[model samples]
Target chain A: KIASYSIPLAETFPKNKVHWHVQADRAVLLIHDMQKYFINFFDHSQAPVPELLANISELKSLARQANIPVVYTAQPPNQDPIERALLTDFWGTGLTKDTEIVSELSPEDGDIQYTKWRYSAFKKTPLLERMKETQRDQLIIVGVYAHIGILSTALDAFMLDIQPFVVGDAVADFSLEDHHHTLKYITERVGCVTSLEALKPQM
Target chain B: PKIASYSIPLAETFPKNKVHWHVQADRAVLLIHDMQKYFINFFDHSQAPVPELLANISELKSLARQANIPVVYTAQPPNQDPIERALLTDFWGTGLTKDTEIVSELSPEDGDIQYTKWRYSAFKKTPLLERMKETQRDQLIIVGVYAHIGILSTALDAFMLDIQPFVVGDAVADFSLEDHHHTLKYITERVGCVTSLEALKPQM
Candidate 1:
């Protein structure tokens, strides 16, 4: 189980290399794995987790007002061992009761939902297909576990040619070091790392 | 786009692998990624890294074949439809038209498996996963061009798919020495192991 940790300050986040902004019409807001089961591993009321929840809620609300599609990934409970594949080896058994997206940040009308399978939201989901169908090319990513799923999704987005913007202040991880390392990795390699206050999606 | 080539860094400069995974002849598949003419011509063929890159990959391929390990090659086909190519067009403006042959010096042999590379990660749209699993070969020996881009992405994907990826640090070439060094560091720290050609050939 992951221990509770403070979120690194926005000033401590790594510098971004790409000059990519969140264009309203060409972007999709991805709220990845904010489900209760995953959140329970942390002290949800603490520094980073609270900041993570608050920041994500802010992004979701802003994205909705901008008419940019708000997408959420929720891992289904009680996955079959074979279906879980190699993931079970790393993270054993399954996620139980707390499968729903947390209460404060519940999915509203017109919000898109995907039952996430692998570490990436794109795997076994229509996230990419929907983005292409809508002609959107940029992904605005936020959620829990900055190092694992968020990093994997961003890497996939880069390879698939979709510009990924990982909101630094809005994502939390197992530790402050992992979180900072992930943000640095994204900015240097896969995607751009932006803060919640910095996201200016042109309406 | 013309790529300025640099010499492959010395083996001592390569980062240490976090996991000490040795390349076993019985459990490995040698992957020659995106070494086609269209990609190769970006570099000056007579340059430092290019010459060494060819020699190292050729040596590893020969070693693998002699060990009866499966050798797989990925070459992007010419004239791909925009829709079929997807978002790749946005970054690499329409890909190769007619110059898609695997660089002549290291062409695929009779029993080598050849696959079409539609994406940076060779596992995408390719039968690499299923084929590897069928043969019970879960270890991938990755070698080829643009170490920072295609090589890193392939290593990441192979790691996620539960295949142990061993990137030959010196066998691969990159646009710059900095990019090459970063790829070696990223693989060892994150997804895979980084080994040298001399270290690998002896094991095979």
Candidate 2:
């Protein structure tokens, strides 16, 4: 199970002059760890959940209209001991089969689903290879646990020289502090942060 | 390059189990990341940490040679085409000619391999993976400058590649203390072990 607080808005976020504009044709939409196991941690009707879902949903629609690749990452239930070694040690026995992607956000036909095992979706996954194959240099990251998976994936993206656009309102974390902290960190060092509105036109 | 004239004695501070994986001499390779002359200039040589930085890396290199561990170094080529240097130049404002070469103190020896890194990651467009595969080493001992940039990138890449990364916290320096400390904490919590020169002293 996971938890999160309020999402940040780009209008409220101080402008970063280095923000790389999202180009739809060259970008990929990454909806990370929106599984039922993680999503259930938050109150579905709560402020952030409602807002987070709306933003991600809108981004997905834009991606569909723009013909951009939509990629999803989820951990399979009941991981092997060796497979789950480091993660289990740090966290605990992880997600079970009952855990699933929220029904509303489930991957549609032609969408890419990556079976992610580590905190980083890129780790032990074909996410990066697929991005390179499709020639998508920019990644629009929207998902849960901003401090963990989202941050790690964004850092990995930067290291690969792939531009990462983290949509603030679409991503959530354990607490308001964590959510804001992630935005500050990524904005300061790794990648750019945008809002659903800012990204819509480009898509 | 000459081997280090001094060495730290084998000692222990933190228990081995505290690390994600134990570093056995047989399974480890020393990955010296971007210890070029230009990058080192960012630090004040008159300071204590800079002198200590050279000592730690020198000790690691000397121990690595004695342990028969492969030493891998990364450097950006002097005259990379605009296309190759575009992103880095945008952020870092171009790599200088002097920045392209490794500092003389920690130069690669006959047994070492130097990789021409196109990106921050040593593995991105280089044969670093192939060499690691050939050597059959899964553990990496990382040490270098700008802990937040190339060093952190290499560690993250190593973790994704399934190579255990061990960042020698003291051996790695940065342009600012905040950046340096941030990287060490990030690696220890997320990517790898943040060990020290004393903890990594080779057993003779």
Candidate 3:
């Protein structure tokens, strides 16, 4: 047997000249949790620092061509003594509050730096509002870890109606398993997962 | 006096320890699969849905404590080792590239069981089974993200080990509703108890 469904009248549709193309005005590159405390633990041999650094350098070149703003986030030494004690115990030794960003992707003087307490960079930080004030709608996010800050921020940006592109090569995880999980969620569900090569056109 | 269909073979040992006992008491465990700094630093979801899960997870922790159930937690190793990395990369494609860790909200506690599973099923090549058995517990409740992959796989293994699994519905979510539903359907259909946190009341 065949099935038929009722259709709306043609008059219900609008014929105005309207187009919705992906907008591009200002772009903010999101870098999450690549702080001294975090990256000191990433094994260069296993996690491969050379690969990510190469990708970041390439991406920075692309962003520079497009005049996109690159924003980096780091964790501050929790100013409070109690919080410091908590941080020391949680992160273990070698990861002090004053610990610097990993030597691989060191930020320059002009990069915006925000301290993150939790996964979502926006949780207590002004990153989102700051981006808005800058009048940027597109975010090309790149970072070290894929699960926590990267994953959390991608989901947050999608919810906020911002278009995001995850640089597959630019991110790394200590474990390939969890890293893949982060990539899967972002590319498959969170937002558009793109590689450094694919992002060239966006520039 | 009673019996269960879920029985472990005598030859197979629990993953973590030997001479394990399933302790009979109010107890629970929170397992974090593949939440690592490598992964966290890449994707920028501005804390996507964590505060929500944390809110519920906090409540679950409170309930477990009042009920006298011990809460166990864990995070998987980054697996940057070449042997492990090759397999993870070939098997999952994108994952082997980044080191996975336990997401922040569900970080490990002092007394909790902190383990690293070399494989997908936590019971395999780990002391999880032994730990749960040694505790002499009948019920094993699970919470956290990564539903279909980590959560679902573990639930199946938990069932075969003869432990009763109570997976929290709202407390766990995947990247999408469809993905979440796929795993939820499987668990609800076959293995064990599937219900919301509210369905579980305080024992004491």
Candidate 4:
């Protein structure tokens, strides 16, 4: 005479079943390098760029509709060959300083545009300063090249004790393997990965 | 190589930042210490005494490229505000912003391994040592400013873990000249070989 389902920590649950879906007052949407370099590297054979563009475009529309601030980050041009090689290997070389978000999912005028020298957006930049200034307590990261910037920023976010919610299928990577692995890391340890569709109601 | 009177490297002397390890291969990883804008802004590039050291950077990079040695870089926390950290009382109340930057001129390239450090030494709270060991790099050729602060602490930490450090002398600088010279003298007298950056190039 045992029940098929088990529910532990039931007392810790929110007041109502719907209370699990809670939203924060402020959230910083990190759009890591979705530059031409990385997009072009995959070639249509391995990954269809149009599909990635479509997904990001869809997520962008959803984020904007929900009033989330979408921030875009681009790599700097002055990095040396060694640094370039590391970056290119991770995301591909066709990208330069001008690599921007796809025109379809372009950031709005009110959105923040940041420049970073390395993989993590937090290094040697005003991200934390800006975050504190804005009093934004949560971050929702979306964009391309998940492993390098996405993973790095997620780790830093965890260390900093900031709330992070990753947009699952909305993000793209040059290699599906990296995208999948980093997604696992985020969902398992760093943060929870959810999609724009799933997040719509929560917002 | 005839400059016998040249001083010893910084990795040997900085007691708190010593690298104690053995080098198994010719490959070395140079820890470009505190090249962030927070610290480098203080240096006058026009009359930089560390020019020779800078020149050797490209040369060592070339040699490392030729021999396939890994070159790594690390950045400090942007909001560290080291001045407020209680642990920095021993130092001169350095701030987190300045302490964490790698300077504008020394931005690491894509190929260099980039790490984040939370302590004076890179190995203390960071995964740098594990990253190096995972890459199969046993020899650590370190260079940086304040040869005593970060460099010395890291070198000593490395030595304690049995890693051999080959420190470059001309590449380092310190707040106090006496502190710099005394530390170099102590390190070369004790831990590892003190050498020049250019000496690492292949002479054949």
Candidate 5:
């Protein structure tokens, strides 16, 4: 079971090496693995779940209003074993209920929904195709388990030549240390670390 | 000398891997990552873990030679500019060049391939993946130091790139025993397979 920990203060966030601000036309908002099943691991009344929900909602709304493509990755409740493959070896059988994206951050009418298979949102999904379809190159990630799926997705995005932006204040992890480590790793190794405040220019 | 001396943990305590992907000689590429003097010198040569780590890796390297598995080595350049070092300086200041040779014990043989490692992942900015592809080797056998950082990063990168990473748990060292155990568990649960040199040697 995942432990509950407070999200780090904004002052503690890692400094970015590759600074990239969201461009309404060229960016896509990726709300990663916000499914209620995954969210249930944390105490909602606690530090990060609420903060994670709030930040993701704000980013989604901003993207929607700016006409940026909003993408959601939800692993279905009952995954077929053959399709799930090695993921089962690690995470066991899939969620049985509440697999939908949390109510606060549900996908809108035009938003792209992908049934994420692997830790990376880019794997076994049409995410890359959708981005390629629109010629969008920047991916703004905000979601749960910052050190796991979020980190893997960032690595994939960077390797694919897409600019990966992991919002420092918009993601949560198993612990405060894991959250800080995730931000540091992304900022130092692969992606740019941005904030919701920095993304406010989409007005 | 960023790493302090610590004894490597015994094999039994390392986590039991879930996916039991055997490392076949024909399908594997062995990666000896960052075994240079700048790293090994951090450990006391007469220490408990360094001697154990060296012996395990050397045995594995010798086995790789016997099986004719392509062996690869990664070393950071002795000198790098600020621009070349980039974000790495933020974590590891400037990097080390002094005594950067691969330890004399496991010095890469004539047929072994060596790549200049620029990042944590051996595949980053290297021809490793390309060479593996051309050679039809999908499994990467990893053994080296600072397991939680470079080994974890390399294992995860290998997983994401669709290659099976088999990390010899006893053959790598970390900042501490806790980090060493954590790296093995991390790989076993998330990405790669945690194997032991004894189990791997006889099979290969």
Candidate 6:
């Protein structure tokens, strides 16, 4: 089990030039890579674990209350070697066949679940189509490994003309440096980097 | 009429990482992005990288044809309804018209495919992914203007789709050297490989 503490929050979305507001009716909450195996990378007693779980849970509840759809992503486990070649080469095969979404954050009847084979959840997935179907143009991202999958998803979202809001405190990384680096990069180029407190009113 | 040299020092401007990837003829597709006359004018034609950029793209196109690799070009429709181009108009102040026609020198040939680009990413709202899937092309070679804008965005999209991207560093120009070099470094480190006309030509 990892230790528990507080995750840092930069008071407001840094770099105010870009518009960063989100409307509940026009947005979706993307709960990315919250699987048991990936969560094991974080210290259970550390701020990243408990803080991430609590923050995401709160956001899910708020989104539900506000009538926003919640979408979750998983890496389909036990893939064929041919299909998993490049991913295996780069990061090794991901979660095993038996691994499931962490119990605390399981998907409900109305929630959407997507199996993502790439770093970006949009690739080869029904995510973009589904978002278009719902007429939603914004994404609120919260998940683990903020540097890799989360960052890629944010960038891809920006390219597709969908506004991306990465919650600084709701996401965690392998190191504090990685977490801070992702926040800085995404804020400067991709989209807004805000905290839960800043997002509360909008939700 | 010449303004300055068409050259920038890659050794000083490019990232220190000398990492490079080989291009297999069968697995690659050449993506010539938004090289419209309106967009191409961003560079100083008199002494800018325009001449070199055209030459590199032409060479790559010929090489691709010879090797049976698909070549795709993207541009905005000359006339799009305001509602259809709403988001782009908001960001760019207007939509594409006759003024956005592809530059004459780099026109698409009979065998090449042309796509209408709605977003900065060539893959967005276009049949690009479908064609790539049909052809089984896994690598994308990107060359064009506004290096930091559409070009960089397409490169990032390609990477996320599991297609390796190779950017011809000297074959793409932006409004300024700073923007061009910054985009090259970003691609080398985060997105994909950054190569040059010299390296790509000999191999092709």
Best model per TM-score: 2
Q: What CA RMSD would you report for each candidate?
A: 4.5, 4.8, 19.5, 17.7, 4.5, 4.6
Candidate 1 per-residue lDDT, tens place, A1-203, comes to 67767777778888876667788999999999999999999877777777788888888888988989999899998888767765654467779789999998899999978998777788778988898999998999999778778988998987677899999889988888778878987877677889876785443
Better model by TM-score: candidate 1 vs candidate 3 = 1
Q: Residue A111 deviation, candidate 5, in Å?
A: 4.1
Candidate 2: which stretches are off by over 4 Å? A1-4, A11-14, A17-19, A40-47, A81-89, A123-135, A159-161, A175-178, B1-20, B202-204
Best by lDDT: 1
Question: What DockQ was computed for model 6?
Answer: 0.22
lDDT of 5 by residue, B127-152 (tens): 98899889899899999977977788
Which ranges of candidate 5 are over 4 A from the true structure? Answer: A1-28, A40-48, A63-69, A74-85, A92-100, A109-115, A122-139, A155-169, A174-203, B41-48, B77-100, B130-136
Best candidate according to DockQ? 2
Instruction: Give the per-residue lDDT digits (tens) of candidate 5, residues A57-79.
Output: 88788888898888889988788
Q: Taking the tens digit of each residue's C-alpha lDDT, what string does model 6 give over B61-158?
A: 88889988888999888677776664455335566556577788888889889898877788888988888888898889898876877888888788
lDDT of 2 by residue, A93-179 (tens): 888754667877878888888888877777788877888898989999998878888987887787677888888889988787668
Cα lDDT computed for each candidate against the true fold: 0.85, 0.77, 0.56, 0.57, 0.83, 0.78
Determine the iRMS, in angstroms, of model 4.
Answer: 15.3
- Could you tell which candidate, 2 or 6, scores higher by TM-score? 2
Predicted candidate 1, C-alpha RMSD: 4.5
Deviating ranges (above 4 Å) for candidate 1:
A1-28, A33-54, A66-118, A124-138, A144-148, A158-163, A168-203
Q: Which 10-residue window of candidate 5 chain B scores lowest in summed lDDT?
A: B83-92
Chain B alone, candidate 4, TM-score of: 0.76
DockQ category of candidate 5: acceptable
**Worst ten-residue run, lDDT, model 1 chain B?**
B86-95
Model with the higher DockQ, candidate 3 or 6: 6
Pull out the clashing pairs in model 6: A2-A43, A2-A44, A2-A45, A2-A46, A3-A45, A3-A46, A4-A45, A4-A46
Interface RMSD for all numbered candidates: 4.0, 2.9, 17.2, 15.3, 4.3, 3.8
What is the Å distance of residue B46 in model 1 from its true position? 2.3
TM-score for chain A, candidates 1 onward in order: 0.96, 0.94, 0.76, 0.75, 0.95, 0.92
Worst 10 residues of 2 chain B by lDDT: B1-10
